[PDB]
A and B are shown apart, each in its own frame.
With several copies, the nearest count.
Chain A
């Protein structure tokens, strides 16, 4: 993908998020922790209305659109940082997140039941009561890798393999191919909040009130990213907006290939809270 259009999407998003930002923007200087990363919630329907192109792009490439949205959020904060009533009062956050709420409902888009293989790789909305939630955990969302011979710093985001594992890069970032078994990390060198971002895992049981009692109850893993962790409450109806994606176990030669449908959540909204 050229991504020129996606970058344009980020610029449209910045204008779209300007209204959200002022409420979100205020108190950043006030906030004690600059290190703390703060989510900004933007309505999916609102993005769709602001620009059809951005909404359609989000449907087509959710992960790419979201990363662009996060970069746009950072850019918008920079603009807010530029103007402040008091220099000391203003709070600047390096990391900002885009969380989507009120996503448009289409039968493919929102499925109570387990997403199919055709559905995999696409954004999905799941209504279910979470059977179990694992404890808040941390993951190296971004890991710096430096080949010792190459001596240049390059970072790769972890792929969606079971445990969200990453693979060490074959070549050095600065115009050369250099491979090191040991890759130096910013976090290894000095404590870095940015390198380690919290991750959570929960399993959601789809609503038991299916059209058919006979059809099997299904449980789907939901992955929480960054600030999203610990938002969900176990045993409660939860509305999850997320990109359903393949989870792949390492393939074994001449062993039946297994892949799994696992949702990575863009945002978590509590269905039980909406009901109550």
Chain B
């Protein structure tokens, strides 16, 4: 196009806006991180099976694998430090990077089939790639549940615990398609932490009208399977302080992660703790703030499952 010679060169995803709410910035550290994650992913792609990854919509990656891969370590000196300070940014960077490797792999797929069998199109073929999000498991710190406090909030942490409870899968709308009343264009809006929100301004540049229509029916809306697991630290009675119940921290699963959890089984969940929604401080402005930490699982790793 006029703006960029290659759609990919200017923006890693050709459909950048739908995939990423954030706009591309050359200056921003996140784009460099995406490149490092991508390079690591390209090296690990041969091990990965493309078809399996495409159906899953997610790829499980060990934190140990991430640390071992050279490019990520070179670009950001400590992956772990980066994860605690900006958990969302790093997780998103990882997801875009794997998705980009997959888009490139899809382009490669088209090229190889065209070479193998003569095609009328012979190139010029649209390639369809499902959204892929990186999953991180076996995060190194492995902090205990008792340690978690107000300071711990906002930092990506790994929790060692046994889930005792599971919840029935509930589809959660990661993105809700929104059509402004005065504009033909409809754009999906990411819901922060799967929580309903309305953009003040319409995404389309030509019309900025506030009013929106929620197109749940439309394919543009994205629904991701979501699960909730209550995970409690497990300790020997002698090891634990006597007379105090083991702390239980709510954890959640998304996409392919869901349904890999069975109650009574020890599963390590790695992800970012978040201040609890629907609590009195959150619900009411000018109210006493009472909050609890709920941690998403970037990846699911089950010690019991591995056995």
Contacts and interface: CB of A to CB of B under 8 A. Distances in A.
Interface in B59-92: none
B288 A256 contact: no
Contacts of B262: 212, 214-215
Given A137-B293, A138-B290, A162 B166 contact: no
Contact of A138 (B191, B219, B248, B292): B292
B231 interface: no
A161 B288 CA distance: 11
Interface string B260-280: 001111000000001101110
A113 B18 CA distance: 29
- B interface SS class: loop
A29 interface: no
Nearest to B274: A191
Contact of A246 (B151, B171, B291): B171
A237 B151 CA distance: 28
Given A35-B151, A137-B292, A199-B290, A260 B275 contact: no
Contacts of B293: 136-138
Interface in B216-268: 216-217, 219, 223-225, 241, 243-245, 247-248, 258-259, 262-265
Nearest to B193: A256
Contacts of A174: none
Residue among B150, B172, B193, B214 with the most chain A CB within 10 A?
A: B150
Place the interface of chain B in its size category.
35 or more
Nearest to A198: B150
A160 B214 CA distance: 13
Interface stretch (B23-31, B41-49, B100-108, B195-203): B195-203
Interface residues of A, number: 68
- A interface SS class: loop
A161 B166 CA distance: 25
A154 interface: no
Nearest to A213: B262
Nearest to A63: B217
Contacts of A192: 154
A75 interface: no
B281 interface: yes
Contact of B245 (A120, A133, A197, A251): A133
Contact of A251 (B168, B214, B275): B214
Given A166-B286, A252-B196, A259-B223, 4 more contacts: A138-B291, A139-B289, A196-B153, A253-B197
28 contacts: A32-B141, A114-B168, A117-B171, A136-B247, A136-B293, A138-B293, A158-B288, A159-B217, A164-B289, A166-B286, A167-B287, A171-B181, A188-B285, A193-B151, A194-B151, A215-B259, A215-B262, A216-B263, A219-B168, A226-B150, A233-B241, A246-B171, A248-B173, A250-B287, A257-B173, A259-B171, A259-B173, A260-B168
Interface of B: 141, 146, 149-155, 165-166, 168-173, 176, 181, 191, 193-198, 214, 216-217, 219, 223-225, 241, 243-245, 247-248, 258-259, 262-265, 274-275, 277-279, 281-293
Interface of A: 32-33, 35-37, 95, 114, 116-118, 120-121, 133, 135-140, 143, 158-159, 161-168, 171, 188, 190-194, 196-199, 212, 214-216, 218-220, 226, 229-230, 233-235, 246, 248, 250-261
